[PDB]
């Protein structure tokens, strides 16, 4: 019949997805244990948190 | 104030269909997508309904 | 007999909050499109656009009265994005009888349907539909004193409301 | 090494009154010009906070106050005698427990095993031949074997004189946080977030550290208390009204459970009746 009738229902769908996060600084020295100018013996190994 | 009342108990109705998505409803989480990111899909099925 | 450098790492997890994750990296920064937005607490499905809101710099969500994520920061950059819900509506099939003729007006209501002859109105537009300067009386009514009817080789044709 | 400080004259600490202060931002949201209704640990209104006076009558006083759910902390201090706080459980070198020292350079804070002292205290020396006031004594720990968690922040100076301001901060324990809110004012006040120290220890009690000033006798004896007031509140689970204005700070706080006016303001979610 004559009239207005609702059949669906409209949505966009999203086009990509964006993740984000804060900065990469403040870095911890790790920077040392890998490059520092002697290495301990192992009876008196290094005990680093 | 006669108009006033049409006013404000349809937009205070409106307002607690809203807070009625926060509610856990029994379940863990109230949001849903924490659901099924936490919970194994064989058995979120009884944490959705 | 050579000598050799050899570190030893180990990991553990106790009741003390975590340090280190990733730090897992991000992606670039898209706006005026309708994206799934992650953050440092939050997932949502929205729109991102330029606002001129006056957050606090401790300050990192937004929400309104119903308790909506509307405003959240990216955490880069001292810039303040407003968060919009992606544009969704109904689907309205306006037509006349079937058998007078077979077509059809789709009303796409409450968008801006850039996204999605046209014309735009105030419940949203009409696709198929043209729009004329003559008031006409009202048969199928759509909103905000809009009617659509089939007159003058026919075609659906959107004028305003003639209230006698 | 540490030495127990005599000449003490006792005295009952009196009681003030607080009038709507104590309140702070509950979470990070933004809220612009809503009435926003909060369930977390507040400092009730109009409440008997604890009121020390350190006053030359040689009054000088820094009790172990108990930490029970969070602790409102106050000072009108015009000279920088509040420095910093102890936080631990028993303090005897058995517990894992928190150090804050804002000495004359940094910030530091140190979260480890402290043998404590009797009297923990900071004492500063002062030099008669060019009138200048420098730290001498670090009394407050005897040795630490192994420390978890370190910072130090960025270098400053301080005048360190006893001249002839509020700040004001609130400190809480939850689920392995350590969370202080903290405003410089010179009444209502609402207290920003300044660090988040997220350790994950267990805190009991607490005391204050205060820089009495030296200049008369034996290490023991030749002190003066200065000028110094500090007050002392205790949070607790009371539910609140705050009033958001259209930039985001709290201008109003409404306690639910202080009297029937404002139960009838929170069961509204409005200010005016
Ligand atoms: C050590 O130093 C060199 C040169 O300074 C650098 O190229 C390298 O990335 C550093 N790290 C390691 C793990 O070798
Ligand atoms: C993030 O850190 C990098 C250093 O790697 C710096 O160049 C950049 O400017 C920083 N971004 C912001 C928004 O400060
Ligand atoms: C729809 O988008 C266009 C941009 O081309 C804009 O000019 C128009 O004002 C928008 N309509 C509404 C109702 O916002
Ligand atoms: C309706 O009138 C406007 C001027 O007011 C004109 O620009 C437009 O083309 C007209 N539309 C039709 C279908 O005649
Ligand atoms: C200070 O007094 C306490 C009171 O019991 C005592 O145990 C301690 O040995 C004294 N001396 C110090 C801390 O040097
Ligand atoms: C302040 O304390 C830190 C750490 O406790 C120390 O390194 C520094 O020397 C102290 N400042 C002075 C002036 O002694
Ligand atoms: C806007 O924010 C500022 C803080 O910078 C505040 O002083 C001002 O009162 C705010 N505006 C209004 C209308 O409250």
Known sequence: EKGIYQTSNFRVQPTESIVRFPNITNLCPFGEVFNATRFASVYAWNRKR | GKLQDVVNQNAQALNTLVKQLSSNFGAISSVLNDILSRLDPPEAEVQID | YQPYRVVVLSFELLHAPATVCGPKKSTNLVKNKCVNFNFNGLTGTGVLTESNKKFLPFQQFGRDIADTTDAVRDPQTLEILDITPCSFGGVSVITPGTNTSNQVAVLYQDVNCTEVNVFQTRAGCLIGAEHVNNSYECDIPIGAGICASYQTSQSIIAYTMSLG | ?273
């Open chain 4, 1 to 273: 090494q540490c030495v127990n400080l005599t000449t003490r004259t006792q005295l009952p600490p009196a009681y003030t009154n607080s009038f709507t202060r104590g309140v702070y931002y509950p979470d990070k949201v933004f809220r612009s010009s809503v009435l926003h209704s909060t369930q977390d640990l507040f400092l009730p209104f109009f409440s008997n906070v604890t009121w020390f006076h350190a006053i030359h009558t040689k009054r000088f006083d820094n009790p172990v106050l108990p930490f029970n759910d969070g602790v409102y902390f106050a000072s009108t201090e015009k000279s920088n005698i509040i420095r910093g706080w102890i936080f631990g459980t028993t303090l005897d070198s058995k517990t894992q427990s928190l150090l804050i020292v804002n000495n004359a350079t940094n910030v530091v804070i140190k979260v480890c095993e402290f043998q404590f002292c009797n009297d923990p205290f900071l004492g500063v020396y002062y030099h008669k031949n060019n009138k200048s006031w420098m730290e001498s004594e670090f009394r407050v720990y005897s040795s630490a074997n192994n420390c978890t968690f370190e910072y130090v922040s960025q270098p400053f100076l301080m005048d360190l004189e006893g001249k002839q301001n509020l700040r004001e901060f609130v400190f809480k324990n939850i689920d392995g946080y350590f969370k202080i809110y903290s405003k410089h004012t010179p009444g209502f006040s609402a207290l920003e977030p300044l660090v988040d120290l997220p350790i994950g220890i267990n805190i009991t009690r607490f005391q204050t550290l205060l820089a009495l000033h030296r200049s008369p006798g034996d290490s023991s004896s030749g002190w003066t208390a200065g000028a110094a007031a500090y007050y002392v509140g205790y949070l607790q689970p009371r539910t609140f009204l705050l009033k958001y204005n259209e930039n985001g700070t709290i201008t109003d706080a409404v306690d639910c459970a202080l009297d029937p006016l404002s139960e009838t303001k929170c069961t509204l979610k409005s200010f005016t009746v």
